[PDB]
Design a protein around this ligand. Structure first.
Ligand SMILES: Cc1ncc(COP(=O)(O)O)c(CNCC(=O)O)c1O
Ligand SMILES: Cc1ncc(COP(=O)(O)O)c(CNCC(=O)O)c1O
Lengths: 414, 409
C-alpha cells in the first residue's frame, strides 16, 4: 500500500499493457461513435480517488453509517450542480448507469405488468425503452412508437397509441435520432391520458446543458441521463425529477434497486458538472452541432443520404444503400482505415438487424480532441472514400495515412 | 487538468476524506482499503469505452484491448474460486443479485432468503427492495443457539416450494453449511444462490468454506473482504452461463464500466498472491482476538464465537444501546455500526448491538496485539460512554495507532 510501489505496472504487467494499448488506440483512431467522448483528466482523477473505500448508503445528512461528512459534501455538490445545469427541481446522482437510472424511475412509479410507451429500438429507441430482452420489455407491457414517412417522430400515431393502450408511463428520447424532439407535444399527449412522461436525454444531455438542444426538464415528470456521452463526464447515471416525485425516486434508487453508491464516481460527476457549467462547455457544444452538420453536409455531397434529411444535434444516421454497402461491411472497412463508427438499422431496413443498411455517426469525441469545420469536412470525405471502395487495400491505406495525419495533429491527451 | 485546478471544492473534500480514513480506526465489517494499483486502474482512460456485450462478442468494434482486460478478470476470478463461469460486469453487488433474479425468475415467484432481522441483506428479500417488492419472500433465520436453523429452513422449503433459495449474510459470524443448503434446495427443485459478498476474500484464501462447488450461483461484491474496487460479480455453473450473461446484458445493464473491470482484474491478481492468503489469515486471527478480548471485558458475541471476519456484539450487559455505542465510539474515532441482535428488545433504529469487522484494520497493518488493544479501547468506551475523560483517553490512543499504522504510505 505504498503509492510508489503499488502501480499498475508493478502489480499487474498484463493489465498495464492492455491499458497502454487502449490509450494509444484512443489516440490513433478517429472516434465517431455518437455515445463516446473523452473525459477530462480531472474527472478520471476523481474516480481514481480513495472515495471508493467509503460505504455511504442513504443520502446526504441521512446516511446509515457515520463518517460520511465529506462524501455528503461531494454528493450535494453533484446534486446542486446538475440541478443548476438543467433547471431541475430535484435530482438523484447515485444511479450506477443510465440503465439503472431508467430502472429507478420504473421501480418508483410502476408495477411489473404495467403498460408503457417507448420509441421502438428499430427506429432509434434504446434497449431500456422497452426491448423484450431488456427488463423494460420483459417485465412490462410495451407499446412502441416510431418515425413517420418524413423520418421525424410520428407524434400523431403516438397520440393514437396512447389513447388506445392507456400507458401508465411514456418514454421519450433516443439513441439514434438526429432531430430536435418536441418534449412539449409529448408532455401534452402524456397528460391527456394521465400518463407519466419520462425523457431519456442521455445522448443530448451535453447539448441541452449548453442550450443548443431543447430542454425536456420543464415538460417531463422525470428526466434520466448518462453522465458520459455528450455531457463528457464519468460513466454513470442521473435522475432528474419534479419535486413531487422526490421521495419515491430517492427511495427507489435506495434501498430499492441499489445499495452503496460509488462515491468516487459521484465526485467525478460533480467535476464533470462543474466543467459543464463553464462558458467553454457551451462553446464546445456549439462546435459539436456545427461539426455534425458539416459532416452530414459532406456525406450528402458525396451521394449518401441522412435519415430525417438533416441533423439538429450531435448525431446522424447514414443510409448507405446508394453505395451498395451494408452497415456491417461499412463498419469493418472504416475500422480498417482507423475510423470508428457503428452499424445501425435504418427505418424500413431491408437487411437483417445484425447487418443493417446504415452507420451511426457522432461528433462529440472528435470535437473534444479539437476538430473544427475543416476537419469535419475532411473526415466526411475520408468516410465516403472508403465506402465507395471498401476492400481496396490501396484506398484503405491512403485513408489510414490521412487519418494518421489528423490524429497526430489533434492528440487527445497531452 | 487537475482536480485542484478544475474543481477546488471537490478537491478539498477528497483531501478531507483521505485524512478521515487515516485518522479513524474503521471496524465496519464491509469496509476495506483498496490498493493504489486498483484505484489507478479505475482512474484510467478505459472509462471512455463503450463495450456492450462480452469479450470477442461485442456490438462495437475497437474492443480488442478491453477484451483482454475483461477476459483476464473473468479467468482470474474463475481461478480464485474454482468457478465454471463468471460475469465480471455487474455494477454492484445489488446488480449481481438482480442479474441472477432476472435470469432465473419471473415477478411473483417465491424465494427464500435469510431474514434482515437475523443478518440477511436488503437484496435477500426486503419488502422495500426489488427482491422483496416484486417477489414473494419466505424468510428463514437462526435457532436458539444463534446458528442457522437448517431444520426450519428445510421445513419452509418443503412447505412453500421456493423457485430459488438465497444464502449468505451481512452480519453472521459462523461458517455457513453450503452443502446442507444445496441438499435442501435440490430436495425441492430450487436453485441455490449464495451471496458471499462479506466472506469472498476469506473464501479466496481458503480460510472460509467455499460455496462454489455447492451453489448454482454465487454472487459477490468485489469490494469488502476481497479488497477490490466497488462493483459486483456473478459466478455460475456452466449450464447457466448463457442465461446469466444475457440477464446482465442486455437484461439489466448496458455498457460495462471497463475501467472498474480493469480494477477488478488487478484486485483478482492481488488476491491470487500468497500475500493475500496471509492477509486473510490475519483477518480471521484479528477478528477472533477482538471477539475474545470483548468477552473478557464482559460483552457477549452472538453465536458464541466468530469463525470469520465479523462479529455481532450483544451490548446488554453493559446497559448501552447500539445507537449510543456507535455515537460514543465515533467520538473516540472508532467507526462501528449499530446492529440488531436476535430477539432485540429495542426499536430497529436503536438496537442492542454493534457489528464489528477486522478487514479494514488488518489491511492497514494491525496484528493480534493491536486487535486486543482495540478490543480494550472499545470496552472502555462501552463501560463509560458519556465520560469525557474516557472518550479523550481512547481518542489519544487511537491517534497513536493510526499514526503508527497509516493506510496509504
Ligand atoms: C438513450 C440512452 N439511454 C441509456 C443508455 C445506456 O446507459 P448505460 O450507462 O450504458 O447503462 C444509452 C446507451 N447507448 C449506447 C449507445 O448509444 O451507443 C442510451 O443511448
Ligand atoms: C451480502 C451482501 N450482498 C450485497 C451487498 C451490497 O452490494 P452493493 O454493492 O452495496 O449494492 C452487501 C452490502 N452491504 C453493506 C454492509 O453490510 O455494510 C452485502 O453485505
Amino acid at each position: 500500500f505504498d503509492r510508489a510501489q503499488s502501480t499498475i505496472a508493478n502489480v499487474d504487467p498484463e493489465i498495464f499493457a492492455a491499458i497502454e494499448q487502449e490509450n494509444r488506440r484512443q489516440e490513433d483512431h478517429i472516434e465517431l461513435i455518437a455515445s463516446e467522448n473523452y473525459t477530462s483528466p480531472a474527472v478520471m482523477a476523481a474516480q481514481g480517488s480513495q472515495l471508493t473505500n467509503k460505504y455511504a448508503e442513504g443520502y446526504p445528512g441521512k446516511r446509515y453509517y457515520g463518517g460520511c461528512e465529506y462524501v455528503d459534501v461531494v454528493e450535494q455538490l453533484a446534486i446542486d450542480r446538475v440541478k443548476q445545469l438543467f433547471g431541475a427541481e430535484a435530482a438523484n446522482v447515485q444511479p450506477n448507469s443510465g440503465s439503472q437510472a431508467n430502472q429507478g424511475v420504473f421501480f418508483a412509479m410502476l408495477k411489473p405488468g404495467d403498460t408503457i410507451m417507448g420509441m421502438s429500438l428499430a427506429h432509434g429507441g434504446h434497449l431500456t425503452h422497452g426491448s423484450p430482452v431488456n427488463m423494460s420489455g420483459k417485465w412490462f407491457n410495451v407499446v412502441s412508437y416510431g418515425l413517420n414517412e418524413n423520418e421525424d417522430i410520428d407524434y400523431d400515431a403516438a397520440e393514437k397509441l396512447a389513447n388506445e393502450h392507456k400507458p401508465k408511463l411514456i418514454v421519450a428520447g433516443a439513441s439514434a435520432f438526429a432531430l430536435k424532439i418536441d418534449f412539449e407535444r409529448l408532455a401534452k399527449i402524456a397528460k391527456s391520458v394521465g400518463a407519466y412522461l419520462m425523457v431519456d436525454m442521455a445522448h443530448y444531455a451535453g447539448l441541452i446543458a449548453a442550450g443548443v438542444y431543447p430542454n425536456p426538464v420543464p415538460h417531463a415528470d422525470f428526466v434520466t441521463t448518462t453522465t458520459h456521452k455528450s455531457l463528457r463526464g464519468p460513466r454513470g447515471g442521473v435522475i432528474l425529477m419534479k419535486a413531487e416525485y422526490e421521495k419515491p425516486i430517492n427511495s427507489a434508487i435506495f434501498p430499492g434497486i441499489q445499495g452503496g453508491p460509488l462515491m468516487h464516481v459521484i465526485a467525478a460527476k460533480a467535476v464533470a458538472f462543474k466543467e459543464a457549467l463553464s462558458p467553454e462547455f457551451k462553446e464546445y457544444q456549439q462546435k459539436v452541432v456545427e461539426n455534425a452538420r458539416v459532416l452530414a453536409e459532406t456525406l450528402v455531397k458525396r451521394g449518401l443520404r441522412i435519415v430525417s434529411g438533416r441533423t439538429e444535434s450531435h448525431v446522424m444516421l447514414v443510409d448507405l444503400r446508394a453505395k451498395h454497402i451494408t452497415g456491417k461491411a461499412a463498419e469493418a472497412a472504416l475500422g480498417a482505415a482507423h475510423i470508428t463508427v457503428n452499424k445501425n438499422a435504418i427505418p424500413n431496413d431491408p437487411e437483417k438487424p445484425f447487418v443493417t443498411s446504415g452507420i451511426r455517426l457522432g461528433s462529440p469525441a472528435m470535437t473534444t480532441r479539437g476538430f473544427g469545420p475543416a476537419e469535419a469536412e475532411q473526415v466526411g470525405n475520408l468516410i465516403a472514400d472508403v465506402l465507395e471502395n471498401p476492400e481496396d487495400a490501396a484506398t484503405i491505406e491512403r485513408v489510414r495515412a490521412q487519418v494518421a495525419e489528423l490524429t497526430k495533429r489533434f492528440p487527445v491527451y497531452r
